Each structure stands twice: as C-alpha cells, then as structure tokens.
Amino acid sequence: XQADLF
Amino acid sequence: XQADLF
Amino acid sequence: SHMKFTVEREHLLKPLQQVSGPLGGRPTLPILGNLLLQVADGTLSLTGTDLEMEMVARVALVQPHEPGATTVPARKFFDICRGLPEGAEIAVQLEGERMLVRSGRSRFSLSTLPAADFPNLDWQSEVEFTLPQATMKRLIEATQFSMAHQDVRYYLNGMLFETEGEELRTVATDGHRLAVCSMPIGQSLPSHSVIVPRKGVIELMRMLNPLRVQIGSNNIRAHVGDFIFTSKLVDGRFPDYRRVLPKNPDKHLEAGCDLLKQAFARAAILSNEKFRGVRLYVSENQLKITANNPEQEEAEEILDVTYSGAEMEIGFNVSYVLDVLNALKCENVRMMLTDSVSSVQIEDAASQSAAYVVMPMRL
Amino acid sequence: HMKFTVEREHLLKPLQQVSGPLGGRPTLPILGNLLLQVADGTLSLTGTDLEMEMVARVALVQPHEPGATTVPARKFFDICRGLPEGAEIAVQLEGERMLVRSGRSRFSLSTLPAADFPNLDDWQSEVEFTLPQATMKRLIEATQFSMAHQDVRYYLNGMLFETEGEELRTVATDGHRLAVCSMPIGQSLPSHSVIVPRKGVIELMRMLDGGDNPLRVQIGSNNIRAHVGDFIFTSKLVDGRFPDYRRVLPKNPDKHLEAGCDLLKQAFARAAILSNEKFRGVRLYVSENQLKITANNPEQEEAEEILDVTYSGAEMEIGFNVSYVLDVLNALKCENVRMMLTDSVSSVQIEDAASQSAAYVVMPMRL
Numbered sequence: 001x002q003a004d005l006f
Numbered sequence: 007x008q009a010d011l012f
Numbered sequence: 013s014h015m016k017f018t019v020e021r022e023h024l025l026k027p028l029q030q031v032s033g034p035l036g037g038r039p040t041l042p043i044l045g046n047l048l049l050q051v052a053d054g055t056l057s058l059t060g061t062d063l064e065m066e067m068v069a070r071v072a073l074v075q076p077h078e079p080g081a082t083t084v085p086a087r088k089f090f091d092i093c094r095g096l097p098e099g100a101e102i103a104v105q106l107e108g109e110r111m112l113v114r115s116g117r118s119r120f121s122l123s124t125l126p127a128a129d130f131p132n133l134d135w136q137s138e139v140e141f142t143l144p145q146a147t148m149k150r151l152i153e154a155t156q157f158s159m160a161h162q163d164v165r166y167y168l169n170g171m172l173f174e175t176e177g178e179e180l181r182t183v184a185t186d187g188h189r190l191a192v193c194s195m196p197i198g199q200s201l202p203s204h205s206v207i208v209p210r211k212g213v214i215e216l217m218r219m220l221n222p223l224r225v226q227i228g229s230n231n232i233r234a235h236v237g238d239f240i241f242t243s244k245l246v247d248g249r250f251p252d253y254r255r256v257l258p259k260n261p262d263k264h265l266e267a268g269c270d271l272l273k274q275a276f277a278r279a280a281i282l283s284n285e286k287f288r289g290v291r292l293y294v295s296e297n298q299l300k301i302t303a304n305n306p307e308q309e310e311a312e313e314i315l316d317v318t319y320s321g322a323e324m325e326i327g328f329n330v331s332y333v334l335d336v337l338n339a340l341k342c343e344n345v346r347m348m349l350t351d352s353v354s355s356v357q358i359e360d361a362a363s364q365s366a367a368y369v370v371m372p373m374r375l
Numbered sequence: 376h377m378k379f380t381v382e383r384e385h386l387l388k389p390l391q392q393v394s395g396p397l398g399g400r401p402t403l404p405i406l407g408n409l410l411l412q413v414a415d416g417t418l419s420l421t422g423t424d425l426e427m428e429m430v431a432r433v434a435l436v437q438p439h440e441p442g443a444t445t446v447p448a449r450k451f452f453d454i455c456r457g458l459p460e461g462a463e464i465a466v467q468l469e470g471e472r473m474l475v476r477s478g479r480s481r482f483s484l485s486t487l488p489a490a491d492f493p494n495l496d497d498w499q500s501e502v503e504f505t506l507p508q509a510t511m512k513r514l515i516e517a518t519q520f521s522m523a524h525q526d527v528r529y530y531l532n533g534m535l536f537e538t539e540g541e542e543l544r545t546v547a548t549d550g551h552r553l554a555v556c557s558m559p560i561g562q563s564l565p566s567h568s569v570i571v572p573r574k575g576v577i578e579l580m581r582m583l584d585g586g587d588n589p590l591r592v593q594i595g596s597n598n599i600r601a602h603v604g605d606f607i608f609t610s611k612l613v614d615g616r617f618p619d620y621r622r623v624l625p626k627n628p629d630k631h632l633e634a635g636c637d638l639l640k641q642a643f644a645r646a647a648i649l650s651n652e653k654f655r656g657v658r659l660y661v662s663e664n665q666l667k668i669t670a671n672n673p674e675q676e677e678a679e680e681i682l683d684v685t686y687s688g689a690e691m692e693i694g695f696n697v698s699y700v701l702d703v704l705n706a707l708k709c710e711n712v713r714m715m716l717t718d719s720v721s722s723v724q725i726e727d728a729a730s731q732s733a734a735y736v737v738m739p740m741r742l
C-alpha cells in the first residue's frame with residue numbers, strides 16, 4: 001503496497 | 007438477595 | 013476428486029445458510045469451519061457440525077452430476093454463492109485438493125479437506141412425533157430467555173423438552189427465575205424428559221413446513237422439510253418445575269401488561285446498576301413500585317391494580333420482571349404471591365399455557 | 376428555584392440531540408450531565424465533551440421559575456422517553472435533587488452545580504452562510520467514509536470544509552484514498568478552509584433531520600457553529616495544515632475506463648472473498664474493452680472475474696485494496712462509473728460517468 005497519496 | 011429457586 | 017454438480021443459486025442459499033448454523037467463529041479444528049458436500053444418486057447433501065450437533069440439508073439434482081464427497085470452507089462457499097447474480101447456474105467440480113466453482117465468467121478455486129476427515133455423530137429413537145412450526149416457535153420463544161448462559165450447572169445452559177399425555181412442554185431456568193410453556197400436539201406420548209443444549213435450542217429455533225421430532229436416549233432429531241437437525245443431549249438432573257411453582261398462592265394480582273411494564277421500566281432507571289432491585293408494596297387494589305441507588309436517587313410509581321389479599325413488600329430484580337412482561341405479549345397479567353421470601357408466579361390473565369416463576373431479593 | 380412543566384414530546388428530540396456529544400465513560404462526572412437553564416420563557420439544554428457542545432431551546436408556555444442545574448443525561452432522557460405519550464413533566468429543584476413528576480410517577484435525581492458546567496471559550500465568526508440540510512448531508516455522506524480514524528497525521532482524523540466562490544466543498548482522506556464533494560450554495564463566499572474533527576462531522580451529520588429549517592453555518596478561526604431550528608451545535612476545529620487535494624488528483628490521466636457501477640461492485644465483492652483478510656489486495660488487468668479482477672490468499676485460493684467495459688488504451692496491471700474500491704462504488708449510487716488511470720504505481724480517479732460533483736482518488740498497492 002500500500003502506497004501513500006502524500 | 008437475590009434468593010435461589012432451588 | 014470426481015464429485016460434480018450444477019445447481020441454481022437459489023437452491024443452495026437457504027441450505028448453505030442453514031447448515032452453516034452450528035458453525036462458530038474461531039473453529040477449533042479447520043474442518044469444523046468446513047461443510048461436508050456429498051453427491052449420491054440425484055441428491056446433494058450438505059452437513060455442518062460442531063461435534064455436539066449437526067445440520068444436514070438435501071438438494072435434488074435435476075442437472076448432470078457425478079458422485080463423490082469433499083469438505084469446503086463454509087462462509088467462503090456461502091459468500092460466493094450469495095455474491096453471485098440471481099438465477100446463476102453454479103457448476104462445482106473437484107480438481108484434486110481444490111474445489112472449482114464456476115458461474116458465468118466468475119471462477120473460484122477453494123481449498124478442500126478430505127471428506128474422510130469429517131466428523132460425525134453416532135443411536136435409536138424412543139419417542140417420535142410431529143408438530144406445527146408455530147407450536148415449536150411459541151414453546152421456545154416463551155422460555156428461551158430464562159435459560160442460564162455459561163453456568164457451572166451445565167444442564168441449566170439448555171432447555172428441558174418434556175412429553176406428557178398429548179402435550180409438549182419446555183422449561184428453562186437459571187436458578188433465579190423459570191419459564192414453562194405447555195402446548196397440546198394432538199398425539200398421545202410416553203412420559204419422557206430431555207435437556208437440549210442452548211446452542212441447539214437456537215439452531216432448532218432458526219430452522220423454523222411441518223416439524224417432526226425423534227427423541228432418543230442421548231440425542232434429539234428434528235426434520236423440517238429437506239433439513240435434518242441432530243443434537244447430543246445434556247446429561248444432567250434438570251430441576252423439577254412443579255416444586256418451584258407456588259403450591260397454594262393466597263395472593264392474586266391483576267394489571268394491564270403494558271402499564272405494568274412501563275412502570276417497572278421507569279423505576280428500573282433509578283435502581284442499582286449491578287443488583288437491579290425494585291421494591292413492591294402491594295395493598296388493596298394498588299401497587300407501589302420503588303427503586304433507589306447508591307447515589308440516593310429514587311423512583312416511585314403508583315398503579316391501580318385488581319388486588320384483594322394481605323399487604324406485603326416484596327423485592328425483585330427488575331430485569332427478571334421486565335423479561336417476563338416482554339415475553340407475555342398480552343393485555344392483562346396475573347401475579348400470584350405468598351410472602352416476601354417466596355417465589356411469584358406470573359402469567360397471562362387469559363391463558364395458563366405459559367407460566368413464569370421469579371425468586372425475590374432482600375433489598 | 377428552577378421550575379418548569381413541559382410536554383414529553385417537547386423534550387424528547389432536544390434530550391436526544393443534546394446527549395449526542397456525550398461519551399459513555401466521562402472523565403469528569405459533570406461531563407455525563409446536561410445543563411438545564413430556565414431564563415424568560417425558554418428552557419435551554421446543553422451537552423458537552425469539552426471539544427464540542429449541543430444546545431437546544433424549548434419554549435415555556437406554562438408557569439416556570441428561572442434557575443439552572445445539571446442532571447444525569449441518560450437517566451433524564453430515559454425517564455422522559457419512558458413516560459406515556461402526551462405526559463406533562465413537572466420539574467423542580469429541591470436542593471441537590473431535581474424532582475420529576477408526571478401522573479403517578481415520581482423521580483428524584485442527583486444534581487451538580489450549574490456553575491461547574493464547562494463553557495466553550497468565546498470566538499469571532501469569519502465566514503457565515505445558509506444552505507439546505509440535504510446539501511450538507513450529501514456533502515458529508517459523499518466523503519466521510521474516507522477520513523482517517525486515529526492516524527499519526529491527526530489533521531486527517533476529520534474532514535476539510537472549504538468555501539470557494541459560491542461553493543461548499545468537503546475533502547476527506549486517510550493517505551491511501553481521498554474523497555472530494557463540491558455543491559453550489561447560491562452565495563458568494565470568502566476563500567476559507569478548516570478541518571472539522573471526525574466526532575464533530577458525525578454530530579453535525581446527526582442534527583440534519585430533513586427540513587422546514589435551513590442550516591446556518593458560522594466558521595471561525597478555531598470553531599465551527601451550526602444552527603438548525605432550535606438547535607445550536609459548536610465544535611472546536613483541528614489545528615493542522617490539511618494536505619492539498621488538488622495535487623493528488625491525477626494531473627493528466629491518459630487511460631479511461633467506463634463500466635456499470637453494480638456489475639463492477641458485484642465482481643469486486645466476489646473477488647474480495649478470496650483476497651487476503653488483512654491486506655485485501657486484488658489485481659486489475661485492463662485490456663481493450665475488458666477488465667479482469669483476480670484475488671488470492673495465503674491458503675492459495677484464487678478468484679477471477681472477467682467483465683466487458685469501455686476501454687481503449689494501453690494494457691496495464693494495477694493492485695488495489697478491494698475495500699477502498701468497494702467503498703467508492705457504494706458511495707457512488709449510480710448507473711455507470713468512469714475510472715481514470717496513468718500507470719501501475721499512480722493513483723486512480725473514480726467518479727460517476729454522469730456527474731463530477733464528487734470525485735474519488737484511490738492509491739494502488741504493489742501486487
């Protein structure tokens with residue numbers, strides 16, 4: 001993996 | 007609590 | 013690795029939901045979270061178990077099928093079937109240690125456990141009879157709230173099923189309060205009494221067109237259409253209800269069920285959170301309910317009732333009273349008393365088919 | 376002194392609304408009480424948790440005496456609720472007890488001094504506006520599922536309320552997915568943006584009954600106030616710098632997918648059954664006019680769904696938390712969905728194919 005938007 | 011029926 | 017069947021979604025749903033009944037959350041053994049699937053002749057059988065009880069469902073196979081057996085994850089298989097479009101054709105087949113489920117362009121591969129590893133209950137019937145769903149549902153609903161939950165007296169964590177003459181009777185108690193309901197079933201029966209475990213009573217309740225019962229020495233079976241429920245019985249000495257029922261009550265009270273319920277419900281707000289004791293001052297044609305708590309808060313309710321007998325104060329766990337009144341879904345209640353240290357019998361003023369006994373408190 | 380006699384039906388909705396901000400385990404006992412004030416021909420009822428408060432005003436058409444006290448909230452509401460329809464509830468204070476009488480029912484409750492009741496500190500409004508309750512309920516409902524719960528980034532445990540031109544906008548993100556909804560309110564507003572705490576978004580949401588009163592909002596520096604008929608809600612704001620949503624929206628997506636909302640939802644929901652219980656990852660393969668969704672778990676069980684979609688562009692494989700996708704599709708209560716992609720490591724924008732008022736951004740998982 002979850003990858004982050006920020 | 008009281009009391010018991012049996 | 014040969015089992016094959018194609019069934020319509022709607023022929024699997026109710027059976028899958030019914031057999032998954034005895035199955036709990038967090039199964040001890042992985043196979044207990046599995047359903048046994050067996051194809052024999054033109055019938056698919058689905059079995060669910062928890063070792064103490066089991067639920068079997070039979071589904072007619074009008075489409076091509078191959079005989080065989082396997083066990084598959086219960087919730088997962090039910091969810092796949094339920095998640096499928098209405099009217100979907102569900103084609104199932106075994107591919108070694110995998111069960112394949114196909115319907116339209118949806119494909120699922122579930123992991124199986126050998127059918128040979130599936131547990132099963134061993135018995136012969138002694139008492140047999142039929143009864144309408146509604147009679148069972150009413151016998152259960154009338155008493156189930158009075159069952160103990162996780163008592164050391166393990167036989168109290170269940171419901172007594174008793175046959176006498178042409179009647180079926182259910183009894184449930186937790187040592188503080190008791191519920192008994194008797195219904196005529198239209199058949200002469202031998203005097204027999206067994207204890208059904210609470211998890212079974214719940215399962216029996218959830219399978220409720222007609223209902224047939226077979227009682228054995230250590231088992232109970234219930235057939236309702238294409239479903240067969242079996243349960244082991246509780247080995248224990250259930251208390252005799254006939255002895256806890258007030259033998260000769262001299263005091264008799266009558267009141268409106270709803271006014272009495274609403275009065276106890278309001279007094280309860282200011283009763284002790286742990287002990288829930290309310291006081292009853294009964295006097296000629298009048299009831300006064302009072303409650304108080306450690307914070308010194310007080311409630312008082314006065315009601316007009318039909319009462320001619322001796323004045324007396326009697327303490328009660330208001331939850332036990334409210335439980336009874338919510339069970340009696342009637343217009344008027346009859347209360348039968350004796351003294352401040354003895355049980356009270358509560359019933360519908362227009363029916364004696366159910367009776368409820370509550371033991372008092374010293375406040 | 377405090378004395379009032381009011382009808383049961385005039386207290387029920389007020390007592391239920393003012394008991395809203397109240398937690399189950401109050402730190403201070405007074406925090407489980409409601410402040411009761413009689414002043415002129417009005418009874419005011421207040422409930423607080425120190426971060427937020429709810430006030431209700433009830434008109435007094437019967438004899439009354441001015442005064443104040445605090446009284447256990449749940450108990451007073453339950454007494455009133457328990458009394459018959461039309462009951463006339465006569466309240467009077469008798470020292471450290473408040474007496475409640477109605478018919479042949481009598482209750483004596485314990486009180487705490489009104490003087491000890493907590494006040495929210497005074498503040499100055501900066502932005503003021505009116506809107507239908509339905510607009511506010513739709514702005515909240517569209518985004519609330521995307522707020523963080525108890526994140527590190529405390530400024531995400533809430534919803535951004537932003538005014539721009541004639542529009543009110545809500546944004547909610549947890550760092551993994553985002554939701555933004557904008558509605559025109561018919562009034563020119565100064566550009567202002569504040570963060571409402573998630574507990575206050577919930578309270579604001581619960582005061583929106585349906586109508587015959589508009590919603591009057593007052594936003595300040597560190598507070599938000601909402602007036603609906605005879606109820607006034609006030610909340611403290613979250614002290615933080617909300618991230619910019621305008622930079623997380625795919626800047627120039629080259630890939631566009633269209634599909635039926637329900638068929639897409641039902642397939643995802645079926646694939647989800649055989650996805651990892653903890654991580655919930657599903658694989659998306661997009662190819663000409665087709666979508667394939669696959670899932671597998673540690674037990675090596677596998678699900679696969681194939682769908683007809685409207686897609687013309689480069690083939691791509693992208694991972695997603697199926698719960699985040701399902702949340703968006705269930706939010707979008709529509710006929711068709713539009714998905715805008717770029718690559719396997721970049722966010723996807725999801726929206727109704729016929730409405731842009733709401734937009735959802737979901738960040739992928741690798742495998």
